[PDB]
Amino acid sequence: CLKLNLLDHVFANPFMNAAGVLCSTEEDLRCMTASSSGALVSKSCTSAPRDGNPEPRYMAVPLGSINSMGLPNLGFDFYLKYASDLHDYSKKPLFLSISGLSVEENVAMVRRLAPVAQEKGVLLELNLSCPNVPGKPQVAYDFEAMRTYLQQVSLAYGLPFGVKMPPYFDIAHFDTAAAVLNEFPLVKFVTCVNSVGNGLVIDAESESVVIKPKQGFGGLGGKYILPTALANVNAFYRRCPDKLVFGCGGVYSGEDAFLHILAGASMVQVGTALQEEGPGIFTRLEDELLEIMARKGYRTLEEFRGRVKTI
Amino acid sequence: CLKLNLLDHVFANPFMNAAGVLCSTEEDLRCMTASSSGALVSKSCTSAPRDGNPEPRYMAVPLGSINSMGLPNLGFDFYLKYASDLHDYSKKPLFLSISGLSVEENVAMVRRLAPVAQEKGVLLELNLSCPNVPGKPQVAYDFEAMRTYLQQVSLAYGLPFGVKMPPYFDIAHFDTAAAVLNEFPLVKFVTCVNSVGNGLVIDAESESVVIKPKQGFGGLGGKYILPTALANVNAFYRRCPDKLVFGCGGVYSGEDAFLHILAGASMVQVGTALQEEGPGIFTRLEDELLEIMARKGYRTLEEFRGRVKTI
Amino acid sequence: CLKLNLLDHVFANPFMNAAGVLCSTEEDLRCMTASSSGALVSKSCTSAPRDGNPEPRYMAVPLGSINSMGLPNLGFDFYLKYASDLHDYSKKPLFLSISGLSVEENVAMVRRLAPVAQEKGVLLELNLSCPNVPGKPQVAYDFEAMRTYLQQVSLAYGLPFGVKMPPYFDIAHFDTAAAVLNEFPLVKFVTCVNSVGNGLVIDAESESVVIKPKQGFGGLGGKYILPTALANVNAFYRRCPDKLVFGCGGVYSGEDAFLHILAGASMVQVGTALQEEGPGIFTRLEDELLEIMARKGYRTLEEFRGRVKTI
Amino acid sequence: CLKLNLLDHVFANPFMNAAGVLCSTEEDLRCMTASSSGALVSKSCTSAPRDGNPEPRYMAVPLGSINSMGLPNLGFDFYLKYASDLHDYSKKPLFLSISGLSVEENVAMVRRLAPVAQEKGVLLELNLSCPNVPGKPQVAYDFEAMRTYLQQVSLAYGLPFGVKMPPYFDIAHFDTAAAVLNEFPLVKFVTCVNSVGNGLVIDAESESVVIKPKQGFGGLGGKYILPTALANVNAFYRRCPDKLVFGCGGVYSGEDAFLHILAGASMVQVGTALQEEGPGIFTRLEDELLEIMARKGYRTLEEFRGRVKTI
Ligand SMILES: Cc1cc2nc3c(=O)[nH]c(=O)nc-3n(C[C@H](O)[C@H](O)[C@H](O)COP(=O)(O)O)c2cc1C
Ligand SMILES: Cc1cc2nc3c(=O)[nH]c(=O)nc-3n(C[C@H](O)[C@H](O)[C@H](O)COP(=O)(O)O)c2cc1C
Ligand SMILES: Cc1cc2nc3c(=O)[nH]c(=O)nc-3n(C[C@H](O)[C@H](O)[C@H](O)COP(=O)(O)O)c2cc1C
Ligand SMILES: Cc1cc2nc3c(=O)[nH]c(=O)nc-3n(C[C@H](O)[C@H](O)[C@H](O)COP(=O)(O)O)c2cc1C
Structure with missing residues (x-):
């Protein structure tokens, strides 16, 4: 089975959408919840609505x-309201991605999210890797900036949460990033990687x-970033042993998701592929992932998660 | 014509091999020199030979x-020997890529290189972006280290030279890297990008x-890194106006090379593609680039270099 | 728009799956129907189920x-059942590919398909180019054999249908194949090309x-056969002016489909690329083809179909 | 050793240019002869010069x-004059490719070539697969015409010779083409394949x-047709046991040449790759093939010729 228990939550499967893909509007969310995805994560939001x-x-x-x-989004208000009132958690776990453009904007949001996550179970994914806001560089590329964000978010949130990480291409950055990440016990998962x-x-x-x-x-x-995504999932899977690593990047097949899991991925998020294929991709990805596990004799994801063989 | 006069040299065309590909042994260099490529760069070498x-x-x-x-190379001695005795400069300009694992090592090389560069005109490509030597993180990802390397090399070399750059993926990083590069007038060209x-x-x-x-x-x-190479070539083309930008990455066709030049590249280096097709690719790339220039009405690379239109 | 009216049917866009790719099971078919593809074609089927x-x-x-x-398929029964009962025609036109291993088998099948097509509008794609059945050489390569299959099918079917053509690499063969196809008015479309x-x-x-x-x-x-596919699509687009030519082979981008359409293709089918990317490819293809039409000022496909310029 | 004895000739290695590539002018021939290729073949020629x-x-x-x-060639006279007076047979065996647009044209040529072939040892490669002469289809796609061409040529030549075969994509065609080929004992080799x-x-x-x-x-x-070329080489390797199959198509590396030999190729011709790289490719191909044989423990080509393993 593709089931797995992570962050005190049951996941039908490890698939879910990558933040920002089919999760901006109530309808995208309702579609994602309707899909066979193991979970869903809302569009990275900010305090107020953004036209992007x-x-x-x-x-x-x-x-x-x-x-x-x-960061085009309907505003924290909407997503928080979706997490608090609209989402049917009996369907699947909900991840609410946040992406304030300042540490205080994020703190302001997580304080408000806290009571909802507390009550609802919605999981926070702090997006510290947006590379598309003019004037705002990937926060997680600035290690002390990231360290601050997490101290501030940890403090104000006080609940388990994850961080959407930007891909790193330097072994030293793998080390340092994980060093920062590991200073925060509330950071239960890191999603590798963002565009x-x-x-x-x-x-x-x-x-x-x-x-x-x-x-x-x-x-x-998409396809461009698979090897880079697998590297980060794996680099952080190894570096952050006490945390979960959520794989994201270049997933189109169950095979891709398989490599992600092989790389150490718990949940596997699909961005681009989903953007083009629609939520139907999840049923396909699940079947594909199962056909593979079948061949290889794996009954559970755990059996091969992070079991990538090195030479 | 695809002819360009760069760094006090005449290049038959903008094409050349990427450092490391078909340029390790004497035979590769003779093979690259025989090729239809406008120039050739040698395998990134260290002072001593390396098995890699x-x-x-x-x-x-x-x-x-x-x-x-x-960095598997035959050692600086060989490449400097080829540079000083074996390479037929009448055929095409020669770039000598140096990749010391320390600033002292690079200084030791560029010091011995200078006299040769002085007489033969061999051009230096400092490799500040090797990402495969265990324990040696990409120097150009460490702006202060990059600075130290550039002043030590500039000082000990005292001649025009270039830098093989690592791909950056953060706007702030393009700005800071350029900020570092721009301090050194001897750095006449930056090759974007390395793996x-x-x-x-x-x-x-x-x-x-x-x-x-x-x-x-x-x-x-290869394919994977084309958008990343164009971004970098363009990022530094705009940021390092007083410098030339050599494009490297994802070049398989003259179209790719067209995008690179459109982005700002003067020289276009081919890595993976050359690694899998042999030097015959240069002839193809050149025909293809010319076929594109012909259609667009371009008679010189200067006509469309860095002319990538934005929206 | 990419819309187009063909064979008394409305197609959202020119794109569809190449027969045999993501269309063997009920789930593959529902997946293709759910995709953004303008149509779908079922796995080339035989009278009974084949393990392949x-x-x-x-x-x-x-x-x-x-x-x-x-020809691994679920048997003709299934696919006729899908055509007759499962396929939602409000979604998109359905093509049912038949590939009996003998003329009698095809006749037996088309006779049964006739009433269904007659009422539902399912379109027949007679596969006379399977090159993988041991002992059964591609029919379309033996022109007398092809003429007989078309006489028998045309006669027994009596409804408009198409032929999945094998690639020809001889001008004489383009002439003769076309000469043959044009004797059968029911042959409304020819799909170039099969593998x-x-x-x-x-x-x-x-x-x-x-x-x-x-x-x-x-x-x-895939990539291998794009030039060959454009040739055939063009050769037959020119030779069968009264018939529609469905393109197929080497389509990975909206530019590839563009070439196909430029070559003369009405419908564009995706095989290998789809096999590896999933139904999301159609959305991507549609976006890419539209961006191209946009740049070129094309509002409709009929504006550039078969408009490949010659020298 | 890459050395091989064939057609009563000694070949330094299995490499040679493909007819048409670098072998039209006296200078091309001199380059191929100078190259490290084991043999060369002249441009397919017609009785009179052709502008192409x-x-x-x-x-x-x-x-x-x-x-x-x-078929742009300097005319048979020149080529016959090259084979009789200008070629240095002490360097490498010479294949003279003949491509008459009529059976009588080929007979006219082979008659005059016979004496020179009897004396100099020049080997005849009858081109029965040119696909670019307007109005003239690939002769070998016409099994009877091909038969007639070989009866006439075999009769007027009376000496060992080969045929440049067009690629077939139908098993029955391999069988029949071989059926036609096998009738003629003088046809000691079939070069698979032409464009x-x-x-x-x-x-x-x-x-x-x-x-x-x-x-x-x-x-x-080039790359497009390698799989097709390996197929034909292997198909005719099996079907024409008493004949040598020269492999041609998609060769860029010693690995490709290795695949062809694996398939059953005795001699390996390089066309497109050579067209772009120059005669230097032969040295590269020989180094690469030897490096492969080195790792596989092959001391001779004979050890792995046609030894391709099937599942
Ligand atoms: C349309 C678009 C919007 C995105 N928006 C977000 C965002 O809101 N927050 C976030 O963390 N990631 C966002 N992503 C990045 C993805 O979540 C993911 O990191 C990236 O697309 C790589 O995964 P992929 O190869 O599966 O596409 C977005 C991606 C795309 C395609
Ligand atoms: C075989 C291998 C060796 C390489 N060696 C070097 C090197 O010595 N110095 C260097 O700067 N880059 C080296 N590179 C990186 C390439 O120079 C080039 O920057 C990279 O492959 C991206 O270009 P491409 O997309 O054309 O392959 C090497 C790459 C590979 C494939
Ligand atoms: C997995 C596989 C199965 C196929 N099955 C069929 C089939 O049943 N009937 C048919 O006409 N073509 C079949 N094809 C041929 C394709 O429809 C298509 O014509 C061919 O793959 C060339 O297109 P492509 O380059 O997009 O792959 C199959 C191809 C592949 C990839
Ligand atoms: C420029 C050009 C000229 C050619 N001339 C001939 C020729 O005259 N005779 C011939 O039999 N084949 C000729 N061919 C076909 C090649 O000999 C060869 O069979 C084909 O190119 C496939 O091999 P390759 O993939 O290495 O290119 C020519 C091909 C090209 C590129």
Whole structure:
């Protein structure tokens, strides 16, 4: 079975959407809850509604996707209200991603989320890796900034929560990031990873960048970022032994999800692939993941999670 | 024509091999020199010869490659010897990529290199972004270290040279890296970019990592990193106006090379693609680039360099 | 818009799945129907259920895929049942691919399919190009054989239908195949092309073929055959002016579909790319094709279909 | 050793250029002779000089090439004059590729070539698979015409010779083609394969075919056709046991050449790759093939020729 118990919650399966994909509106959330996904995470929100960056801000490309959405969301209020009143937790666990543009904006939000998570069970995913807000660089790329955010969020939230991490490409950054992460016992999970910040897709024909925000610089997702995502899931799975690592990046197949789990992933989030395929992808991913586990003789996810064989 | 005059040199075309690919042995260099490439850069060398990391250390994958070569080179002595005696400069400009594991080591090399560069015109490409030497994190990810390396190298070299840059994925990082690079007038060119550091490719069937070194972590190249290379080439093209930007990454066609140049690249280096196709690729890339320039009405690379239109 | 009216049916977009890919089970079909694809075609079926050829029988390779599936299907009964009862035609047009191993079998099937198509509008795609059934060479390669199959089908079916054509690599064959197809007015569409037959993928390390059937000979699909697919789509688009030409082969991007449509394709089918990416590919393809039409100022597909420019 | 004895000739290695690539002018021939290739083949020639088809007629694409050269050759006289007076047989065996547009043209040539072949040892490669001469279909796709061509050629030549075969994609075709081939004992070798006929490359940007001849239809070469080439090499390796099969198609590395030999190739020709890389590729291919044989413990090609393992 693909079931698993994480953060005092039961998950039909490890699949769920990657924050920002089909989880902005009540309808996306209701669809995600309706899908066969093991859980769902709401759009990374801020205090007030955000129109996001100017369009075109998302482009589906052959190897995945580039995007500079710019945290377009219906506002914390809505998502908190969804978590507190609209979500049917009998259906599946809900993760509410937050992404205040300042540590105090995040603190202000988690204080309000606290009583709801306390009462509802909604799980907080602190997004410290948005690479698409102009003027706002991935917070988790600034280690002390991240350290502060977590001290401030831990303090004001006082409940278990996770952090959506930006991909790191330096072994030292793997070490340091995990060092920071491990100083916070409330950080029960880290989601690896967020879009590979600030890629640039150029259309040769038009000789123009494909997205409008930040001169075409946006987060890369999809096939492009799989090896990078697996590295981070694994790097942090090893470094953060007392925490759960949620895999995210380049998942299109049960095989991809399998490598993620093999890499140490508990939950496996699907961004780009979901963006293009729709919630139906989860049933497919689950079947695919099961066909594989079948072949390999794995009855449970635990049997092979983080069991990637090295040479 | 695809001819460009850069760094007091004439290049037949903007194409060349990426440091490390087909440029380790004397035969690779002779092979690169014989190729139709506008130039060639040698394998990143250390003072002493290096066996590199344990094999398998390079894996070609559908979307490029992952490698943890570990700077396997024949030693500075050889490459400086090739630079000073073996390379036929009448054929094409030669770049000597130096990748000391310490600032002292690089200073020891660039010191012995200077006289040669002075007479032969060999161009120095300082590698401040190798992501595969165990315990040696990408120097260019450490802005202060990068600065120390640049002033020590600039000082001991006293000649124009370039830097092989690591891909950055944070706007603040492009700005700070440029801030560091721009302090040194001798740094005439920055090559963007080196392998996307510490990806992890897992074979679902064997449930094992494809490469042996560092538990499967290696630099990614090819398709995967194209948007990341264009972003970086463009990021530093804009930020380092007084410097040339050599594009490297994801180049398989003249279209890719077109995007790189459109982004700001002067020279375009081919890594993975060359690794899997042989030097014949340069002829193709050149025909292809010319076919694109022909259609768009471009007679010179200068006409469309850095001319990537934004929305 | 990508909409288009073909064979008295409305198609949301030109995109669909290549027969045999994600369309063998009821779940595959419901998955394709749920996708953003403008239509779907069921697995080439035979009178009774087939287990197909010995596995491994499919191999995704860097440049596409090879496969000797061997017409593994749930039997004609199932797919007619799907056509007649399961498929929601409000969603999108359904094509039912038939691939009897003899003319009598196809006739027996189409006779039963007729009443269904007659009432539901399910479209027949006669597969005269399967290159994986041991002992059964592609029908469309024996022109007299093809002429007979079409006489019998046209006669026994009496309704408009299409033919999945094998790739031809001889101008004489384009002429003759077309000459043959054009004798059958019921042949409203010809899908170019089926897999490039009997290619052989050999693994260097194992020094063994990658698939088990027919000593490793299987149909190639994907990147490998795009040029070949455009040729056929174009050759037949030119030769069968009274018929529609459905493109298929090497479609991974909206640009590939664009070439197909530019070559003369009405519907564009995705096989290998879909096999590996999942139904999400259609949304991506649609977005990519639209962005291209956008840049080129095309409001409709009919604006650039078969408008490939020659020199 | 890469050395092999064939057709009563000694070959340093199995490599040679593909007919048409680097072998049209006296200088090309001199380059191929100078190269480290074990043998060379002259451009397919016709009795009289041919300008070939209108340019552009050859396009190097990311997966190989497309071409409609139209047999541009310096005429049989020159080539016969090369084989009789200019070639240095002390360097490497010479194959003279003949491609008459009529059976009488081929007979006219082989008659005159016979004496020179009797004296100099030049080997005849009858091209029965050109797919780029307007109005002239691949002769070998016409089993009877092919039969007639070989009766006439075998009669007028009376000496050992080979045939440049077009790739087949139908098992029955392999069987029949072999059936026709096997009748002639003088046909000591069949070169598999020639270009994959009449692929269509269209440039999405210009929306135009890349080559001018035949509305863009040209032979496909390079990476595209490797699997097809290995298939044909192996198909004819098994079907024509008393004949040598020279492999040709998709060779870029010693690994590819290794696959061809594995498949059953005695000699391995390089076309597209050579077209882009130059005669230097042969040294590279020989090094690479030896490096593979080194690891597999193969001391000779004979040890692994046609030893491809099937599942
Ligand atoms: C349209 C778009 C919007 C996204 N919005 C968010 C966001 O709100 N918060 C967040 O943590 N991640 C967001 N993501 C990033 C994904 O959650 C994920 O980190 C990234 O897409 C890589 O996963 P993938 O390859 O599965 O696409 C977004 C991604 C895309 C495609
Ligand atoms: C075989 C292997 C060796 C490499 N060696 C070096 C090197 O010595 N110095 C360097 O700066 N980059 C080295 N690289 C990185 C490449 O130079 C190039 O930056 C990277 O592959 C991205 O380019 P690509 O996408 O074209 O492959 C190496 C890459 C690989 C595949
Ligand atoms: C797994 C596999 C199964 C297929 N089954 C069928 C089939 O049943 N009937 C048919 O006409 N084509 C079948 N095809 C051929 C494809 O429909 C398609 O024509 C071919 O794959 C070329 O397109 P592609 O490059 O998009 O893969 C199959 C292909 C593959 C990949
Ligand atoms: C420029 C060009 C010219 C060619 N000329 C001939 C030739 O005249 N005779 C011939 O039999 N094949 C000719 N071919 C086909 C090649 O010999 C070879 O069979 C085909 O290109 C596939 O091999 P490859 O993948 O290594 O390119 C030519 C191909 C190209 C690229």
